[PDB]
Structure 1
Amino acid sequence: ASLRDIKTRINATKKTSQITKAMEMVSTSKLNRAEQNAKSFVPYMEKIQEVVANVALGAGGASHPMLVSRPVKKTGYLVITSDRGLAGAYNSNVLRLVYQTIQKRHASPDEYAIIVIGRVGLSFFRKRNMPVILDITRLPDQPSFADIKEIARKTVGLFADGTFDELYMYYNHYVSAIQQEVTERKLLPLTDLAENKQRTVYEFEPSQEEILDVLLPQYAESLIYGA
């Protein structure tokens, strides 16, 4: 109960408080920048979704391998995690969801496949003895399309090569600054596609089939980047 021990404990706690406050303000600035990036990105998503909904309904345009359901034999998983911690339950929730989904109905080691975005998820899956396909890490704090254009193109191509008949992705959705959701969905299999009631038939310079062939990967990449 000496005064010196109490004084040194007070000093250490004060220094830790300084560290935490500094990190808090830096994170507020980064949140502002990330919101700017997302809101700047949205218009292209709006336009491409409108165009694809306009073209891919009626007047034929069916039987596309990217849009027709297929007997599933191998499944792939895409997860978006972080690189370092200091985030409360941001990584653990999504990793727990992925682990429980895999251990539910994915018994065969060759049945499933994983591709990660964050180093935390990669280390998690290494410790848990699962096989990965690709790993990208050290992504910047304000990433854009050119950062993992190649990774996304490789993913959509390997699905197009027939490796996985089903594709799934798991990530965190920003509801508010405090509330945070953990969401999941199929991406590439495209069992259900959206539609709009303002469609225009238009004309097809390369015909509908080739038009869809070139269009669909852009849709996949745009959805990935929105997530």
Structure 2
Amino acid sequence: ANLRELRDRIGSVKNTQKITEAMKLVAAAKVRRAQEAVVNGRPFSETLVEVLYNMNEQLQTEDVDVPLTKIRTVKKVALMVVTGDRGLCGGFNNMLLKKAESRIAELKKLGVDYTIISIGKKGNTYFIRRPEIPVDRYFDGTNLPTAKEAQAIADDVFSLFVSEEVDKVEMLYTKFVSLVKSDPVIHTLLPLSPKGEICDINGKCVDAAEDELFRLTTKEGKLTVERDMIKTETPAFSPILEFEQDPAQILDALLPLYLNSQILRALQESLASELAARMTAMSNATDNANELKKTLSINYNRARQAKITGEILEIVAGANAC
């Protein structure tokens, strides 16, 4: 009973190829839904940045003193890492936690008293298995990331910074720039410029090349993504707004919205890049299962012909001896 073994093995490889191409296609559909969420949530932040830019151009000579936008250089650090939810991940969570190790390596070496706010399920599993690194809060993706996860993370980061305990709350995540390569970035979150741009860990305003609103178009016959520069932004005009509230309180109520906007967009971008990595991993798995199905069918046909040959040669040998 070896031929039924090879037949069932070939059947298992066929089924595994089928389910890997199914995972590939449904991951592509969820990439499409993630880009839908991103380009639908964009114009809120568009109007937010135009309002905030006008407000801060009217509020430079003032004293504004909002706790989110102050610069308390006594140098604590709160690096927040967001990782993938489920597995097969391409190479997402490994390189994320690797850059996390590199960042806490340069951090602890400077004695800046870092800490970690882990968001993803794979990342927080990694951190509960390695307690040698300190960690603040735990989050997950069974809860929907579009509203409630981002709201909870914004609540916790706001409660960490406004209660002025730690400085330099930055977020390590993975902007979806390519379907094969997804290099993580470290952008600061709360020690923000009052002008209201996303900055680097150096502060050098990476909104210059942020490349918003990625889209998916094939090039020749394989799937690729297109990222352009500027879309449907109207930030220029600054009409009279007639502030009824005290101007310091206006920014004091505006900046949490920017916190939520940045956290939500980073969650959505890391989700889309995780789904792209899973799409690529499942394409490779389908192709390897296809080549293995071919090899196993070859070996099966060989063994079947050898079995038939041996059987008839044995029967004929017995009949000739008789």
TM range (shorter): 0.7 to 0.9
Q: Aligned ranges for residues 143-158 of structure 1 at < 5 Å?
A: 143-158=145-160
* One-letter amino acid of the counterpart of residue 150, structure 1: A
Classify the secondary structure of the residue corresponding to 1:174.
coil
How big is the shift at 1:219? Answer: 0.9
Matched, 1:135 2:138: yes
**Closer/same/farther in 2, CA of residues 197 and 177 from structure 1, 3 Å limit:** same
Q: Which residue of 2 aligns with 1:212?
A: 251
* TM-score w.r.t. length of structure 1: 0.87
Classify the secondary structure of the residue corresponding to 1:139.
coil
Matched, 1:177 2:216: no
Classify the secondary structure of the residue corresponding to 2:89.
coil
Find the partner of 2:115 among 113, 121, 135: 113
How big is the shift at 1:5? Answer: 4.9
**Segment drifting more, 58-67 vs 159-168:** 58-67
How big is the shift at 1:60? Answer: 1.9
**Closer/same/farther in 2, CA of residues 191 and 172 from structure 1, 3 Å limit:** same
8 Å CA contact retained: 2:175, 2:184: yes
Instruction: State the alpha-carbon separation in 2 of the partners of residues 68 and 128 from structure 1.
Output: 34
Q: Which residue of 1 aligns with 2:320?
A: none
Matched, 1:47 2:57: no
How big is the shift at 1:36? Answer: 1.2
Gaps of 5+ in 2: 198-234, 267-322
Classify the secondary structure of the residue corresponding to 1:16.
helix
How big is the shift at 1:73? Answer: 3.6
**Closer/same/farther in 2, CA of residues 41 and 108 from structure 1, 3 Å limit:** same
How big is the shift at 1:117? Answer: 1.3
* TM-score w.r.t. length of structure 2: 0.63
**Segment drifting more, 124-133 vs 162-171:** 124-133
Q: Deviations over 1:176-215 (max 9, x none)?
A: 3334231111110114735765444532211211111111
**Segment drifting more, 102-111 vs 178-187:** 102-111
Instruction: State the alpha-carbon separation in 2 of the partners of residues 106 and 174 from structure 1.
Output: 29
Matched, 1:222 2:289: no
Q: How many residues align?
A: 225
Q: Deviations over 1:6-60 (max 9, x none)?
A: 4343223222212211211221221121111111111101011111111013342
Q: Aligned ranges for residues 193-208 of structure 1 at < 5 Å?
A: 193-194=195-196, 198-200=237-239, 202-208=241-247
Matched, 1:30 2:30: yes
Q: Deviations over 1:143-166 (max 9, x none)?
A: 322344133122112211012111
**Segment drifting more, 99-108 vs 206-215:** 99-108
Q: Which residue of 2 aligns with 1:13?
A: 13
Find the partner of 1:88 among 85, 90, 98: 90
Task: Say which structure is richer in strand.
Answer: 1
* One-letter amino acid of the counterpart of residue 47, structure 2: K
Gaps of 5+ in 1: none
Task: Give percent identity, aligned residues only.
Answer: 32
Instruction: State the alpha-carbon separation in 1 of the partners of residues 11 and 152 from structure 2.
Output: 49
**Segment drifting more, 52-61 vs 113-122:** 52-61
